[PDB]
Design a protein around this ligand. Sequence first.
Ligand SMILES: CN1CCCN(c2cncc(-c3cccc(/C=C/C(=O)O)c3)n2)CC1
Ligand SMILES: [Mg+2]
Length: 277
Amino acid sequence: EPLESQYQVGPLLGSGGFGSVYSGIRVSDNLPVAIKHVEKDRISDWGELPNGTRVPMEVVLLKKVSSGFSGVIRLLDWFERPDSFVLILERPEPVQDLFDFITERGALQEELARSFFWQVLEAVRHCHNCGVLHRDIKDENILIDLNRGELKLIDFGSGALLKDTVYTDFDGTRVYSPPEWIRYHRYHGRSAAVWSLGILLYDMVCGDIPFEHDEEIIRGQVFFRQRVSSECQHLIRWCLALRPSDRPTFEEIQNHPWMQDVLLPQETAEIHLHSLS
Ligand SMILES: CN1CCCN(c2cncc(-c3cccc(/C=C/C(=O)O)c3)n2)CC1
Ligand SMILES: [Mg+2]
């Protein structure tokens, strides 16, 4: 029953606004896991969860998207403590987040960016279909299962239930938030999500984020610092359309020509990941 008699804690993987996550192993089968600690004082949103009670919104969101689909991390279990909650999440091995992967390898070839991007679209779409809005889509929040070549969306600590009405609260990453939020402190789930997908695609093909200051976000002028195909630039600028309604739907993004003939996960890994893995 105790958390200690359950898992064997390992080294700290990282910490921040989300909390502190450690590498871990489940004593029983040595199944690799991650142990995330979050203080109750940090937690702002709470949920009830089916036939349950007091629980952080993060847990509610995680369980809602839980399933066989490997595009989003799986909550394996959780525990409540006097001042914190502990989340036991799955952990692919080897693994590396998109931020480190790009920091190390730099701007990705378009074929690779296509595969990776396509996989987050499927993951985000999955969340939406399950009534969950992530709100913090970014390189750091996407894990790369190097052997399988499959990406995983993580950290639902900024998410919320998907809704068709306005959002007047945001606590994700500033440099990924849309111009509606910066200017009017209001946005709609899917539109905002598409904007951050635009920032992410740009990050993938250019090695860095397109905007830094609020003034750049509001103006939305995209400058390509690396050689990027015309199709890709078009998609990117379409997602980064100043007016929300001018942004493509997920269907339009995935039907976009630059998005065609995506590589399969294993293919991707064999051609791009095993080369160094
Ligand atoms: C966002 N991350 C910032 C960068 C360092 N960091 C890392 C690094 N490598 C693997 C994982 C890792 C492995 C398995 C599950 C998870 C899940 C995290 C979550 O759902 O919050 C994370 N997390 C902690 C959080
Ligand atoms: Mg999470």
